[PDB]
Design a protein around this nucleic acid. Structure first.
Ligand SMILES: [Mg+2]
Length: 195
DNA sequence: TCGACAGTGAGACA
DNA sequence: TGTCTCATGTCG
């Protein structure tokens, strides 16, 4: 495939268009039809005097028997459904990697956003693979000591690999974009350690 | 608790 | 003067 390499001090990501327009549209429609997001009616849960939040407005799928941590709670993801395995397999076919877990987030319009953050490394092996469908949304990298800014529209059917050491030295965000009126779905594939 | 996003002020430009 | 973008406070 044709890769754009995103290079800077401590930043190594790469970007390509994984699915052409027609196939991206079909997968997008199937994602909207099939993915089941936690609603967040239930907001938190307490054990031994400590509250723990519960994931809202996202969906997790992964291999049978796998568990992952979220705010101190160990959870099991939903078993793979066919469209996710399809996407997972295209990502693998184009990188030589395997993934056992995916986090799906939905951004209904430009006002849904994500504030500057670094992914939890505690449970990861590995490159993080992020696949987008729907409206194009700007994704931005900033350095944890600032140093330059890198901005990338994540287009319909694209794959962004965040390779080591991107996630240690740079924080990422998906900022508000008022003029975007249409939804975006993002899939973040990982390999969860069995250790 | 502490993660998601509400709230806010400064600065741009329309 | 109004709306947007960028970069601490709250609460379930
Ligand atoms: Mg992230």
């Amino acid at each position: 495939m044709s890769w754009r390499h995103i290079r800077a001090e401590g930043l190594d990501s790469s970007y390509t268009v994984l699915f052409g327009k027609a196939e991206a549209d079909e997968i997008f429609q199937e994602l909207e039809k099939e993915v089941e997001y936690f609603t967040g009616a239930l907001a938190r849960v307490q054990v031994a005097g400590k509250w723990h939040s519960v994931p809202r407005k996202q969906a997790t799928y992964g291999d049978a028997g796998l568990t992952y941590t979220f705010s101190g709670l160990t959870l099991s993801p939903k078993p793979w459904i066919p469209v996710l395995e399809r996407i997972r397999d295209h990502v693998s076919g184009v990188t030589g990697q395997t993934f056992n877990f995916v986090l799906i987030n939905r951004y209904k319009d430009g006002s849904d956003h994500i504030c500057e953050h670094r992914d939890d490394e505690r449970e990861l092996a590995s490159p993080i693979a992020s696949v987008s469908f729907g409206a194009s949304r700007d994704f931005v990298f900033r350095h944890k000591d600032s140093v330059a800014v890198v901005r990338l529209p994540l287009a319909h059917g694209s794959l962004l690999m965040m390779n080591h050491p991107t996630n240690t030295h740079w924080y990422h965000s998906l900022p508000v974009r008022k003029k975007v009126l249409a939804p975006r779905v993002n899939l973040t594939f990982r390999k969860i350690l069995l250790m």
